Amino acid sequence: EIVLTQSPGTLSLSPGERATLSCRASETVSNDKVAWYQQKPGQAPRLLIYGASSRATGIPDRFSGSGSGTDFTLSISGLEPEDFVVYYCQQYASSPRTFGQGTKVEIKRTVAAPSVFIFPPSDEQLKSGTASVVCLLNNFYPREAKVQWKVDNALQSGNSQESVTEQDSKDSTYSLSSTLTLSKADYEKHKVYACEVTHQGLSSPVTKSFNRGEC
Amino acid sequence: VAEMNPNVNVFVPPRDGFSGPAPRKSKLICEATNFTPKPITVSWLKDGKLVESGFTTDPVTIETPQTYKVISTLTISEIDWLNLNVYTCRVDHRGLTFLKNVSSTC
Amino acid sequence: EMNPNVNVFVPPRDGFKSKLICEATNFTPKPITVSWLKDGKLVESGFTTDPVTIEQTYKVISTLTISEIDWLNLNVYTCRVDHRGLTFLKNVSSTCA
Amino acid sequence: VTLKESGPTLVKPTQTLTLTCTFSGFSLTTTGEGVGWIRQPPGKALEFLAFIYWNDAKRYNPSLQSRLTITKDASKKQVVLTLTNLDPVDTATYYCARTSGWDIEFEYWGQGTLVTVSSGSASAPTLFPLVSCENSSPSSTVAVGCLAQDFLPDSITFSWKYKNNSDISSTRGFPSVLRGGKYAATSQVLLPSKDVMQGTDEHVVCKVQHPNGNKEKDVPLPVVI
Ligand SMILES: *[C@@H]1O[C@H](CO)[C@@H](O[C@@H]2O[C@H](CO)[C@@H](O)[C@H](O)[C@H]2NC(C)=O)[C@H](O)[C@H]1NC(C)=O
């Protein structure tokens, strides 16, 4: 059992610069049989380098591998917009083999203030016994953001899944959606529902709330 | 939250409301208050002819249903007023047209 | 430093309560005080002053609430404008009288 | 060299799951060549299931030992994978690849197939109107959305049209999340404020193309002007 840990999980680079990916193994690998893979969301993963030193057919020469033993580093010269995908390091000397956590590289951009909108549940949806309150964040950077739900001054926990979209192809920003789920009987026992959004580019937190019956 | 028909009021200068070099000129004020929703169209009519110049409409400002107010000013000539010309303020609100007619006749 | 123009508007001859509008335009500096008078007596309530807006020239308007009976009884209403130590008084009356 | 996967798109928990990896253009006769299965749950990394070498040599993962079986049929040139004791947390997309020697591992990858393990049934999606309750802050533009709920499997495309059947470019698509055995997704659209204070159209239609029904509910605009 060879445990592979990759760090950092997310790194922000710029086009044309150099990116270094680190791969940490829990023990030495015989014959340095470590390979790197490239995977794009939607499509299928593709092999880039096998054995950490030999490239494969149809792979540009700008990808270079180095290191041995328990330390391996992947260097890429001439970073391209199409190269902002997730990369995994894998070793095939274990039998059975193991895969690493993987690291994601994003395009570095400036901090933009997000937009917060909340949609109260519709009357038709309330008839089904389920109420869904949403909290939408759009056009913010970096991806790291905190979304907390506060209803009647009581902080909620253990009831938010949280969905986040991928980086925009033309805007390079991120968006996420937070959904509040509660029982219909519990919904009628609360008046004000609000989600708090905290951002690096905001001096003070901005809170939005609505009054039951006015929407 | 509510739908209310706008109220149309027209202000006219008095007999001594004209000054300046001859020919003297004055202004007409048409104000709509206690109307909802916020959007509203204000137009000026002179003896059935649309006025396309010499008028300035102030932006709508906020004065429990929400209320708004709008102020419009049209420059008029003393000679036209003396000819018993009738000025009509055209107000459009949610597809409804309200007209008010004023004149110097007693 | 230019003296502000004083104009007082009156309700239409053929009918409309109503409001009285006193306008001061092309005045400088921006600070200006506008008040209302009724038959030579100070008015303590029933009047409001709108914030001064930009038409450099400025425009300020005032609103006075009056009743139909009082206005048509030939009562004297005067708009008082104070600017740079000068006081301007404008008197209006019924035209059809 | 290419590979193609195939199998059921919906399987109940605690049952038998069978997948077939269809490949053509090579034979498992030379040494070093082998076939392996790699799965990846959404939001997670790749997971190694098993690998089979030539001469009927197979390897299994100790974490999943005594739970998977590897069988090969040279007549049909396709490996057969059997999965038992299905669990909702094990839902992932399964891929198969060919190793061209001892050093070149997984040189060619196929396309994969989504195998959803949910106790529920493939019911038609349910739409719910969403009206923004924002106040005291008109901001740049207004936001209106569409809540597609109770759909399985997750395959939905969103298109926005006006009342006069116009075209809108939203491109705002949020991924689905497994909540209570069902996938839930949210979709929104941004429209200019000037258009709202213009045409009399007070609502727009939300359209979803799911292979369980062609319903399309309309969301009424709040209108600000
Ligand atoms: C459907 O109605 C909308 C009204 O909301 C039309 O949008 C207007 O027309 C222009 C030209 O297409 C658009 O670019 C603008 O968004 C709207 N005009 C203004 C002044 O805001 C839309 O065009 C109509 N659809 C079709 C096919 O004509």
Short mmCIF file of all heavy atoms in Angstrom, two decimals, chain D residues 26-58:
data_model
loop_
_atom_site.label_atom_id
_atom_site.label_comp_id
_atom_site.label_asym_id
_atom_site.label_seq_id
_atom_site.Cartn_x
_atom_site.Cartn_y
_atom_site.Cartn_z
N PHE D 26 -6.02 -5.24 -31.44
CA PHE D 26 -4.89 -5.88 -30.78
C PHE D 26 -5.39 -7.13 -30.06
O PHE D 26 -6.59 -7.30 -29.83
CB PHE D 26 -4.19 -4.93 -29.81
CG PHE D 26 -5.10 -4.31 -28.79
CD1 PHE D 26 -5.30 -4.91 -27.56
CD2 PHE D 26 -5.76 -3.12 -29.06
CE1 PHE D 26 -6.14 -4.34 -26.62
CE2 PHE D 26 -6.60 -2.55 -28.13
CZ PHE D 26 -6.79 -3.16 -26.90
N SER D 27 -4.44 -7.98 -29.69
CA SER D 27 -4.73 -9.23 -28.99
C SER D 27 -3.85 -9.33 -27.75
O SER D 27 -2.71 -8.87 -27.74
CB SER D 27 -4.51 -10.45 -29.89
OG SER D 27 -3.16 -10.52 -30.34
N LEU D 28 -4.41 -9.94 -26.71
CA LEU D 28 -3.70 -10.10 -25.43
C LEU D 28 -2.83 -11.36 -25.45
O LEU D 28 -3.00 -12.29 -24.67
CB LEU D 28 -4.69 -10.13 -24.27
CG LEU D 28 -6.11 -10.72 -24.36
CD1 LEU D 28 -7.09 -9.76 -25.04
CD2 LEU D 28 -6.14 -12.09 -25.03
N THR D 29 -1.87 -11.36 -26.38
CA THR D 29 -0.94 -12.47 -26.54
C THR D 29 0.48 -12.14 -26.12
O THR D 29 1.14 -12.98 -25.50
CB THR D 29 -0.93 -12.94 -28.01
OG1 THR D 29 -0.52 -11.86 -28.85
CG2 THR D 29 -2.31 -13.41 -28.42
N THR D 30 0.96 -10.94 -26.43
CA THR D 30 2.32 -10.56 -26.05
C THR D 30 2.39 -10.26 -24.56
O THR D 30 1.40 -9.90 -23.92
CB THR D 30 2.77 -9.34 -26.86
OG1 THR D 30 4.08 -8.95 -26.43
CG2 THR D 30 1.81 -8.18 -26.67
N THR D 31 3.59 -10.40 -24.01
CA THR D 31 3.80 -10.14 -22.59
C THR D 31 3.76 -8.64 -22.31
O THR D 31 3.99 -7.80 -23.19
CB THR D 31 5.14 -10.72 -22.13
OG1 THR D 31 6.21 -10.11 -22.86
CG2 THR D 31 5.17 -12.22 -22.35
N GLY D 32 3.45 -8.30 -21.06
CA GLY D 32 3.35 -6.92 -20.62
C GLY D 32 1.99 -6.29 -20.83
O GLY D 32 1.56 -5.47 -20.02
N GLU D 33 1.32 -6.65 -21.92
CA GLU D 33 0.00 -6.10 -22.21
C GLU D 33 -1.00 -6.53 -21.15
O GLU D 33 -1.01 -7.68 -20.70
CB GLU D 33 -0.47 -6.56 -23.59
CG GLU D 33 -1.86 -6.09 -23.98
CD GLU D 33 -2.27 -6.55 -25.36
OE1 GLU D 33 -1.37 -6.88 -26.16
OE2 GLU D 33 -3.48 -6.59 -25.64
N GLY D 34 -1.86 -5.59 -20.74
CA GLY D 34 -2.87 -5.87 -19.74
C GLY D 34 -3.98 -4.85 -19.79
O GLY D 34 -3.87 -3.80 -20.43
N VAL D 35 -5.07 -5.17 -19.09
CA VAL D 35 -6.25 -4.33 -19.04
C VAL D 35 -6.58 -4.04 -17.58
O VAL D 35 -6.50 -4.93 -16.73
CB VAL D 35 -7.46 -5.00 -19.74
CG1 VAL D 35 -8.66 -4.07 -19.74
CG2 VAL D 35 -7.09 -5.41 -21.16
N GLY D 36 -6.93 -2.79 -17.29
CA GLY D 36 -7.27 -2.39 -15.94
C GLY D 36 -8.47 -1.46 -15.94
O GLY D 36 -8.77 -0.79 -16.92
N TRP D 37 -9.15 -1.43 -14.79
CA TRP D 37 -10.33 -0.61 -14.60
C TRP D 37 -10.02 0.50 -13.60
O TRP D 37 -9.50 0.23 -12.51
CB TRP D 37 -11.51 -1.45 -14.10
CG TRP D 37 -11.97 -2.48 -15.09
CD1 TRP D 37 -11.47 -3.74 -15.26
CD2 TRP D 37 -13.03 -2.34 -16.05
NE1 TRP D 37 -12.15 -4.39 -16.26
CE2 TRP D 37 -13.11 -3.55 -16.76
CE3 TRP D 37 -13.91 -1.30 -16.37
CZ2 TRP D 37 -14.04 -3.75 -17.78
CZ3 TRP D 37 -14.84 -1.51 -17.38
CH2 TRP D 37 -14.89 -2.72 -18.07
N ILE D 38 -10.34 1.73 -13.97
CA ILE D 38 -10.13 2.90 -13.12
C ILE D 38 -11.43 3.68 -13.05
O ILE D 38 -12.02 4.01 -14.09
CB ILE D 38 -8.99 3.80 -13.63
CG1 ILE D 38 -7.63 3.10 -13.49
CG2 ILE D 38 -8.98 5.13 -12.89
CD1 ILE D 38 -7.23 2.27 -14.70
N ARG D 39 -11.89 3.96 -11.83
CA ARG D 39 -13.11 4.73 -11.62
C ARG D 39 -12.79 6.02 -10.88
O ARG D 39 -11.77 6.13 -10.18
CB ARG D 39 -14.15 3.92 -10.83
CG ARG D 39 -13.81 3.72 -9.36
CD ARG D 39 -14.91 2.95 -8.65
NE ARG D 39 -14.61 2.75 -7.23
CZ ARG D 39 -15.41 2.12 -6.38
NH1 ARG D 39 -16.57 1.61 -6.77
NH2 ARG D 39 -15.04 2.01 -5.11
N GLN D 40 -13.66 7.01 -11.05
CA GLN D 40 -13.47 8.31 -10.41
C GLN D 40 -14.81 8.91 -10.01
O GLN D 40 -15.57 9.36 -10.87
CB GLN D 40 -12.72 9.26 -11.35
CG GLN D 40 -12.49 10.65 -10.77
CD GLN D 40 -11.85 11.59 -11.76
OE1 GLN D 40 -11.67 11.26 -12.93
NE2 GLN D 40 -11.50 12.79 -11.30
N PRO D 41 -15.13 8.93 -8.72
CA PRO D 41 -16.36 9.59 -8.28
C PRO D 41 -16.29 11.07 -8.56
O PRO D 41 -15.19 11.67 -8.56
CB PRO D 41 -16.41 9.29 -6.78
CG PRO D 41 -15.53 8.09 -6.59
CD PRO D 41 -14.45 8.24 -7.61
N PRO D 42 -17.42 11.71 -8.81
CA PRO D 42 -17.41 13.16 -9.07
C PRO D 42 -16.84 13.93 -7.88
O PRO D 42 -17.23 13.71 -6.73
CB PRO D 42 -18.89 13.49 -9.30
CG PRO D 42 -19.51 12.20 -9.72
CD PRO D 42 -18.77 11.13 -8.96
N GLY D 43 -15.91 14.83 -8.17
CA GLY D 43 -15.25 15.60 -7.14
C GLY D 43 -14.12 14.90 -6.43
O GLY D 43 -13.54 15.47 -5.50
N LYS D 44 -13.79 13.67 -6.83
CA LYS D 44 -12.73 12.89 -6.20
C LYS D 44 -11.68 12.51 -7.25
O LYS D 44 -11.78 12.88 -8.42
CB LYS D 44 -13.30 11.64 -5.53
CG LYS D 44 -14.28 11.94 -4.40
CD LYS D 44 -14.78 10.66 -3.75
CE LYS D 44 -15.75 10.96 -2.62
NZ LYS D 44 -16.95 11.70 -3.11
N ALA D 45 -10.67 11.77 -6.80
CA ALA D 45 -9.57 11.36 -7.66
C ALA D 45 -9.83 9.97 -8.24
O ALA D 45 -10.84 9.32 -7.95
CB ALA D 45 -8.25 11.40 -6.89
N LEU D 46 -8.91 9.51 -9.08
CA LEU D 46 -9.02 8.19 -9.68
C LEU D 46 -8.87 7.10 -8.63
O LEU D 46 -8.12 7.24 -7.66
CB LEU D 46 -7.97 8.01 -10.78
CG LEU D 46 -8.01 8.99 -11.95
CD1 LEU D 46 -6.85 8.74 -12.89
CD2 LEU D 46 -9.33 8.89 -12.69
N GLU D 47 -9.59 6.00 -8.83
CA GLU D 47 -9.54 4.85 -7.93
C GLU D 47 -9.23 3.60 -8.74
O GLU D 47 -9.86 3.35 -9.77
CB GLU D 47 -10.86 4.68 -7.18
CG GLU D 47 -10.85 3.55 -6.16
CD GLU D 47 -12.14 3.47 -5.37
OE1 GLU D 47 -13.04 4.29 -5.61
OE2 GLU D 47 -12.24 2.57 -4.50
N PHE D 48 -8.26 2.82 -8.26
CA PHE D 48 -7.84 1.60 -8.94
C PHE D 48 -8.64 0.41 -8.40
O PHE D 48 -8.66 0.17 -7.19
CB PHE D 48 -6.34 1.36 -8.73
CG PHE D 48 -5.84 0.08 -9.34
CD1 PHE D 48 -5.56 0.00 -10.69
CD2 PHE D 48 -5.64 -1.04 -8.55
CE1 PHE D 48 -5.09 -1.17 -11.25
CE2 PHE D 48 -5.18 -2.22 -9.10
CZ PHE D 48 -4.90 -2.28 -10.45
N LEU D 49 -9.29 -0.31 -9.31
CA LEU D 49 -10.10 -1.47 -8.94
C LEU D 49 -9.31 -2.78 -9.06
O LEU D 49 -9.13 -3.48 -8.06
CB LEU D 49 -11.37 -1.54 -9.81
CG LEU D 49 -12.41 -0.43 -9.68
CD1 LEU D 49 -12.58 -0.01 -8.22
CD2 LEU D 49 -12.07 0.77 -10.55
N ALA D 50 -8.84 -3.10 -10.26
CA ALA D 50 -8.12 -4.35 -10.48
C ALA D 50 -7.37 -4.25 -11.80
O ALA D 50 -7.64 -3.39 -12.64
CB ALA D 50 -9.06 -5.56 -10.48
N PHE D 51 -6.41 -5.16 -11.98
CA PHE D 51 -5.63 -5.26 -13.20
C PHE D 51 -5.37 -6.73 -13.51
O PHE D 51 -5.11 -7.52 -12.60
CB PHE D 51 -4.30 -4.50 -13.09
CG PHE D 51 -3.59 -4.31 -14.40
CD1 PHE D 51 -3.85 -3.21 -15.19
CD2 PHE D 51 -2.66 -5.23 -14.83
CE1 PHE D 51 -3.20 -3.03 -16.39
CE2 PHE D 51 -2.00 -5.06 -16.04
CZ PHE D 51 -2.27 -3.95 -16.82
N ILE D 52 -5.44 -7.08 -14.79
CA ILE D 52 -5.25 -8.45 -15.24
C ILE D 52 -4.14 -8.47 -16.29
O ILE D 52 -4.19 -7.71 -17.26
CB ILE D 52 -6.55 -9.07 -15.80
CG1 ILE D 52 -6.26 -10.40 -16.48
CG2 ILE D 52 -7.25 -8.10 -16.74
CD1 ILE D 52 -7.50 -11.07 -17.05
N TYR D 53 -3.15 -9.33 -16.08
CA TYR D 53 -2.06 -9.51 -17.02
C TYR D 53 -2.40 -10.65 -17.98
O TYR D 53 -3.53 -11.13 -18.03
CB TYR D 53 -0.75 -9.76 -16.28
CG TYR D 53 -0.27 -8.60 -15.44
CD1 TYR D 53 -0.68 -8.46 -14.12
CD2 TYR D 53 0.58 -7.64 -15.97
CE1 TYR D 53 -0.25 -7.39 -13.35
CE2 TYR D 53 1.02 -6.57 -15.21
CZ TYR D 53 0.60 -6.45 -13.90
OH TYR D 53 1.03 -5.39 -13.14
N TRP D 54 -1.41 -11.08 -18.76
CA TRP D 54 -1.61 -12.19 -19.69
C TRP D 54 -1.58 -13.51 -18.92
O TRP D 54 -1.53 -13.53 -17.69
CB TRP D 54 -0.56 -12.14 -20.80
CG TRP D 54 0.80 -12.60 -20.36
CD1 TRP D 54 1.37 -13.82 -20.61
CD2 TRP D 54 1.76 -11.86 -19.61
NE1 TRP D 54 2.62 -13.88 -20.05
CE2 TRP D 54 2.89 -12.68 -19.43
CE3 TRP D 54 1.77 -10.57 -19.06
CZ2 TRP D 54 4.02 -12.26 -18.73
CZ3 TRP D 54 2.90 -10.15 -18.37
CH2 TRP D 54 4.00 -11.00 -18.21
N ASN D 55 -1.63 -14.63 -19.65
CA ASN D 55 -1.62 -15.99 -19.09
C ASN D 55 -2.57 -16.13 -17.91
O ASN D 55 -2.29 -16.84 -16.94
CB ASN D 55 -0.19 -16.43 -18.72
CG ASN D 55 0.37 -15.68 -17.53
OD1 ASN D 55 1.05 -14.66 -17.68
ND2 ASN D 55 0.11 -16.18 -16.33
N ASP D 56 -3.72 -15.45 -18.00
CA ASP D 56 -4.77 -15.51 -16.98
C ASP D 56 -4.25 -15.10 -15.60
O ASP D 56 -4.64 -15.65 -14.57
CB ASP D 56 -5.40 -16.91 -16.93
CG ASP D 56 -6.76 -16.91 -16.24
OD1 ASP D 56 -7.72 -16.36 -16.81
OD2 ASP D 56 -6.85 -17.46 -15.12
N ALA D 57 -3.36 -14.11 -15.58
CA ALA D 57 -2.82 -13.57 -14.34
C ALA D 57 -3.59 -12.30 -13.98
O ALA D 57 -3.62 -11.34 -14.76
CB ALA D 57 -1.33 -13.28 -14.47
N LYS D 58 -4.21 -12.30 -12.80
CA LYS D 58 -5.02 -11.18 -12.35
C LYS D 58 -4.54 -10.69 -10.99
O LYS D 58 -4.03 -11.46 -10.18
CB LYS D 58 -6.51 -11.56 -12.28
CG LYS D 58 -6.77 -13.05 -12.07
CD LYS D 58 -6.46 -13.49 -10.65
CE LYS D 58 -6.74 -14.97 -10.46
NZ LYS D 58 -5.94 -15.81 -11.39
#
